[PDB]
């Protein structure tokens, strides 16, 4: 069986070559446990790479490109064999073939090489695969090509350390057009690619925003498929980690009522946790951005999550309420208190996460300054919010934080007690 396939690919007869390349392809196209290792050991990989350059025989090109796609879909050691036989520059060249079938297979193959690791991803981009990949993207592009290329594009952006920004910047106009598709697969892969490009410094977020993605990304927060929603939510969340102007791009497109609906629907814990992290990066902004959070009606259900939800959700909801106390106005902080935020912030003071203790302590302190301003202005006998902290059992918790190992938590507790309980 196999010594006839090797002889066929190693023969110089066009029909013998196509017959055994189809046989090798079929053997590599099997469901689970493909004999990729045995196909490599048969010494046929360099012949398939040679069969890629045969532009007078497009059927063999496609069969050889599909067999190499499946070898490149295995282990890193299998992907390296494809790289060592110089397939990467030949697949970039095959993106300019008269055959739609060869172009599509070359796109998949490069996606599989770029998918292996940041090193392999970097080799594909250094071989200039990005521009010709984007060149076969237009209004006459078939759905199968739109899906293969959008998935390859996501692999070009994928991994840590991230690719150079100048290297993935040409992708942004194409990705902004691809998120307008109604195909869930295209949407999933374009959202994944945008979640990678937006994960970083503010100069990256700025370019993502200038491509005009914010209105369509907000709409995608309401996509019924979680496959779309997960990278959509992550992209929105990465954009709002930028400056106030960058964060405003998302808020202007009614994202806050959309983010609220993710907190009130019967959704996965990981989706609610991400919505809370997103909201927290918005309450980390200016007084107008906090107002928009208040206006959307998020504070109420956020305070309930801060009190009743699973620890990972409570963590993000803690950062969201505390951020609002940090940048917020006097009357906004008071609105947070009237929505019942003091008790749940107090209850997380004995929490084993020192970061969360510090966040809730800062939130309670910010609230205390406001309560003090009300006392001074009205010549009152007591700080109303210091009474509420004591009623919520928060006072005894702050007094106990004087025994905490952490200096920052200790020094905070002492500073709070000296300024409000002497």
């Amino acid at each position: 069986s196999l010594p006839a396939m090797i002889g066929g690919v190693y023969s110089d007869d066009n029909n013998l070559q196509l017959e055994a390349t189809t046989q090798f392809r079929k053997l590599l196209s099997i469901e689970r446990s493909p004999p990729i290792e045995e196909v490599i050991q048969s010494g046929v990989v360099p012949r398939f790479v040679q069969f890629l350059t045969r532009e007078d025989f497009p059927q063999l090109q496609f069969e050889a490109a599909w067999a190499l796609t499946n070898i490149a879909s295995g282990t890193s050691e299998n992907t390296k064999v494809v790289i060592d036989h110089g397939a990467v520059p030949i697949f970039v060249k095959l993106l300019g073939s008269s055959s739609d079938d060869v172009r599509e297979q070359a796109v998949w193959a490069l996606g599989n090489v770029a998918g292996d690791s940041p090193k392999c991803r970097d080799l594909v981009l250094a071989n200039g695969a990005l521009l010709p990949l984007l060149a076969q993207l237009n209004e006459h592009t078939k759905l199968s090509m739109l899906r293969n290329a959008t998935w390859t594009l996501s692999n070009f952006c994928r991994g840590k350390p991230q690719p150079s920004f100048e290297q993935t910047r040409p992708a942004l106009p194409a990705l902004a057009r691809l998120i307008h598709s109604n195909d869930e697969e295209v949407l999933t892969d374009a959202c994944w690619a945008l979640s990678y490009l937006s994960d970083g410094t503010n100069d990256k977020i700025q370019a993502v925003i200038e491509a005009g993605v914010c209105p369509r990304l907000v709409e995608l927060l309401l996509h019924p498929s979680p496959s779309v929603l997960i990278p959509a939510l992550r992209t929105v969340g990465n954009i709002v980690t930028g400056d106030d102007a960058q964060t405003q791009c998302i808020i202007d497109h009614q994202a806050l009522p959309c983010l609220l609906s993710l907190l009130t629907q019967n959704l996965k814990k990981s989706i609610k946790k991400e919505a809370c992290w997103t909201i927290s990066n918005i309450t980390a902004g200016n007084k107008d951005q906090i107002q928009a959070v208040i206006n959307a009606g998020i504070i109420g259900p956020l305070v309930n999550l801060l009190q009743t939800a699973e620890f990972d959700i409570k963590k993000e909801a803690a950062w969201a309420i505390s951020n609002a106390t940090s940048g917020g106005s006097h009357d906004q902080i008071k609105y947070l208190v009237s929505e019942g935020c003091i008790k749940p912030l107090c209850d997380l003071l004995i929490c084993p996460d020192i970061r969360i203790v510090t966040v809730c302590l800062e939130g309670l302190e910010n609230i205390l300054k406001v309560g003090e301003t009300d006392k001074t202005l009205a010549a009152g006998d007591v700080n109303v919010f210091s009474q509420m902290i004591d009623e919520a059992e928060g006072l005894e918790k702050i007094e106990n934080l004087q025994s905490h190992d952490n200096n920052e938590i200790y020094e905070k507790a002492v500073k709070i007690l000296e300024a409000y309980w002497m």
């Binding site: 469901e31 599909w66 879909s73 998918g115 994928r158 969340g237 709002v240 980690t241 940090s326």
Partner: peptide, 21 residues
């Protein structure tokens, strides 16, 4: 404060895809 916090959990699609047909 307040400070903007980047994502601390790794979220990504499928690295490789095998062509079955």
């Amino acid at each position: 404060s307040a400070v903007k916090r980047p994502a601390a959990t790794k979220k990504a699609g499928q690295a490789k895809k095998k062509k079955l047909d």
